[PDB]
Design a protein around this nucleic acid. Sequence first.
DNA 1: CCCGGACCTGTGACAAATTGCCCTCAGACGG
DNA 2: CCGTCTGAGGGCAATTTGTCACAGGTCCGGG
Length: 212
Amino acid sequence: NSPRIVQSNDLTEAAYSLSRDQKRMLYLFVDQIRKSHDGICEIHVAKYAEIFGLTSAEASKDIRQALKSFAGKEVVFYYESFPWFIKPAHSPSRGLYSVHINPYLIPFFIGRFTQFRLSETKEITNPYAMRLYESLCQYRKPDGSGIVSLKIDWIIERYQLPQSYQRMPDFRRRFLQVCVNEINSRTPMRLSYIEKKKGRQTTHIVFSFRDI
DNA sequence: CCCGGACCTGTGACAAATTGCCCTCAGACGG
DNA sequence: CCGTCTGAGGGCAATTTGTCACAGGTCCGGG
Ligand SMILES: [Mg+2]
Ligand SMILES: [Mg+2]
Ligand SMILES: [Mg+2]
Ligand SMILES: [Mg+2]
Ligand SMILES: [Mg+2]
Ligand SMILES: [Mg+2]
């Protein structure tokens, strides 16, 4: 009943490492850009706080640190690499931020597409669970269900999981179980899965889901 | 044969990072 | 001018995320 995010599958499937707060800002950029090619977006502290139920102070802290942490971050489309920002962010007015997204990213944002309402993701905390929920939406049916098999090496490459999750028991305990639990507790989706094996190695995860 | 070895699992510890909270004080504005 | 609503700073303890040692399973093959 809330803003409807839509994005090219190329972003859903891109390789990058962003925090929760950065991904939150990124949804509004994609929304602003889409409602129109200069790459200039803006974020208001007082509106961000209302959208995500934060105080003005903690809103200010999240934006500021998110913004300075974009520096040096890059995005790869499988491959081709780009910087997100081509100028530091800056504040012309108190409570207002202005940002310069790489105009070469515009066609990767708007294209074979993914869509969800912002209320679906705004309570998720772990950013890897946000990645997972975006990739499942890419396969959702009008009625709200789907089934998809994701390869483990591709999950590790695209979501840029940290090195110790290449050991399968650590992958299970700290990524897979936590993110399925968040989705089931924080979104209107109800998710289950099963592991596919080849010899002793586990190679894919097969996800099934329906809507509440 | 049958050991050492190369694989695989899960769990207990600890280290590093993130969470929502709390308090201070100056900016912008309007009555 | 000043009182109030903001937000830009400085911090906190409680949880979560990231890493690795060690117990305990299987199957393989040469000396
Ligand atoms: Mg992280
Ligand atoms: Mg925060
Ligand atoms: Mg023995
Ligand atoms: Mg093996
Ligand atoms: Mg025992
Ligand atoms: Mg043994």
